[PDB]
């Protein structure tokens, strides 16, 4: 199968530069466009450009010539884009999608920014009598971290039923939290295994807390 | 640019209905090639975009059957047969024709169904936050619809104003409900001078409020 494998989440200060990275597999990279796209809310989905990596051949939108540099190396079959002169209106998520769109990678979260990273503290929501009929609730709580994003999981991604994770949410003061839960039955109460996974990549922070009854 | 107008913004739907988003280019797509570069992509939230059409009316492998594609020159239509539960998300239209290539600005479709009383559950603070300085109380609201709801705090039989947050999840890409979590927030002096904590919900489902409670010590 076609895979567009993009580099980690970055935090950098105003005036740098990045270079964000789209591993390739499963076709003959030298053969298909590379395309670079933007995403961000107010402005939409925006086409950066594009690369030929059999030739270097590239087409920019021209509201991006000036920011992103297109690069590739057949070598290891990866695409780079560069974004320099870095300011606030860039934050954003980046996408690599090949040919007219047809596989994209899973994107790569820029924020622009003069804060440092701060990592989540993970609470356990812990089920008790007071968390109905025959269903009880448990959940992990992520707290005060910056920036985005955040990765969260339930037994490494073998729970997915009746898991439930809420958006991230910016608050005033100017981290993030956000929370996971699972919905289960009440005999599933202190008997099954729940570890909520937490990975806080900028931060170095990953968590694997075990939600047991208080 | 080639703008990209996509009609309607929100399109909401009854389970096993027909749904239809349309799309219009401010210049010809048709390419001095023969084809026309029309795709269309759904974006689930938290995830990459995903072709589901091509070529204005090929299918993408695994895309389902109820989804067609149609039209030519600036105007074009992506239909669904019947939605189903999954096929929730933002969908955009996208030309390749032109320099530079340009998207819609997306068109979220959102299911439509019956009422749904929510199930609701309360979480005192967890010893590891509060040996760590702080307290969060939090309320939860399971798998209900509409969206809307009304969530009280009272501390000590006190109205609460002003000290909490609600956020709400993406609709359910299986039943098409929601769910919605509140947090209050307060001091740990502040909640270890304190005894009982109760979230009220009200909600069109509910004949009556429910209402979760802890007393704290009391466990
Ligand atoms: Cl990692
Ligand atoms: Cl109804």
């Known amino acids: 199968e076609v895979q567009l494998q993009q580099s980690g989440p970055e935090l950098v200060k105003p005036g740098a530069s990045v270079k964000i990275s789209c591993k390739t597999s499963?076709?003959?990279?030298?053969?298909?466009?590379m395309n670079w796209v933007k995403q961000r809310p107010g402005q939409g989905l925006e086409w950066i450009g594009r690369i030929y990596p059999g030739d270097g051949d590239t087409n920019y939108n021209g509201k991006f010539k000036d920011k992103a540099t297109l690069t590739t190396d057949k070598s290891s079959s990866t695409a780079y884009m560069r974004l320099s002169s870095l300011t606030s209106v860039d934050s954003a998520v980046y996408f690599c999608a090949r040919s007219l769109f047809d596989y994209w990678g899973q994107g790569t979260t820029l924020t622009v920014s003069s804060a440092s990273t701060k990592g989540p503290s993970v609470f356990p929501l812990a089920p008790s009598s007071k968390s109905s009929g025959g269903t009880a609730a448990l959940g992990c709580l992520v707290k005060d971290y910056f920036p985005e994003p955040v990765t969260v999981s339930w037994n490494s991604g073998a729970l997915t039923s009746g898991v439930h994770t809420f958006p991230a949410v910016l608050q005033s003061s100017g981290l993030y939290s956000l929370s996971s839960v699972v919905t289960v039955p009440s005999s599933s109460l202190g008997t099954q295994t729940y570890i909520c996974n937490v990975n806080h990549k900028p931060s170095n922070t990953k968590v694997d807390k075990r939600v047991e009854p208080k | 640019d080639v703008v990209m107008t996509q009609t309607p913004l929100t399109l909401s739907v009854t389970i096993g209905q027909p749904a239809s988003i349309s799309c219009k280019s401010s210049?010809?797509?048709?390419?001095?090639?023969?084809?026309?570069?029309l795709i269309w992509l759904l974006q689930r939230p938290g995830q990459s975009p995903k072709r589901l059409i091509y070529?204005?009316?090929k299918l993408d492998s695994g895309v389902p059957d109820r989804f067609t594609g149609s039209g030519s020159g600036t105007d074009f239509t992506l239909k669904i047969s019947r939605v189903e539960a999954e096929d929730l998300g933002v969908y955009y239209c996208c030309q390749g024709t032109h320099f530079p290539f340009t998207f819609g600005v997306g068109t979220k479709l959102e299911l439509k169904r019956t009422v749904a009383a929510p199930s609701v559950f309360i979480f005192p603070p967890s010893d590891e936050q509060l040996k760590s300085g702080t307290a969060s109380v939090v309320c939860l609201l399971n798998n209900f619809y509409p969206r809307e709801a009304k969530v009280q705090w009272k501390v000590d039989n006190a109205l609460q104003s002003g000290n909490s947050q609600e956020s709400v999840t993406e609709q359910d890409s299986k039943d098409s409900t929601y769910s919605l979590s509140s947090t209050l927030t307060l001091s740990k002096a502040d909640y270890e001078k304190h005894k009982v904590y109760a979230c009220e919900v009200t909600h069109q489902g509910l004949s009556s409020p429910v209402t979760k409670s802890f007393n704290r010590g009391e466990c």
């Open positions: 070529l204005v009316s």
């Open positions: 499963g076709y003959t990279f030298s053969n298909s466009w």
């Open positions: 210049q010809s797509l048709l390419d001095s090639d023969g084809k026309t570069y």
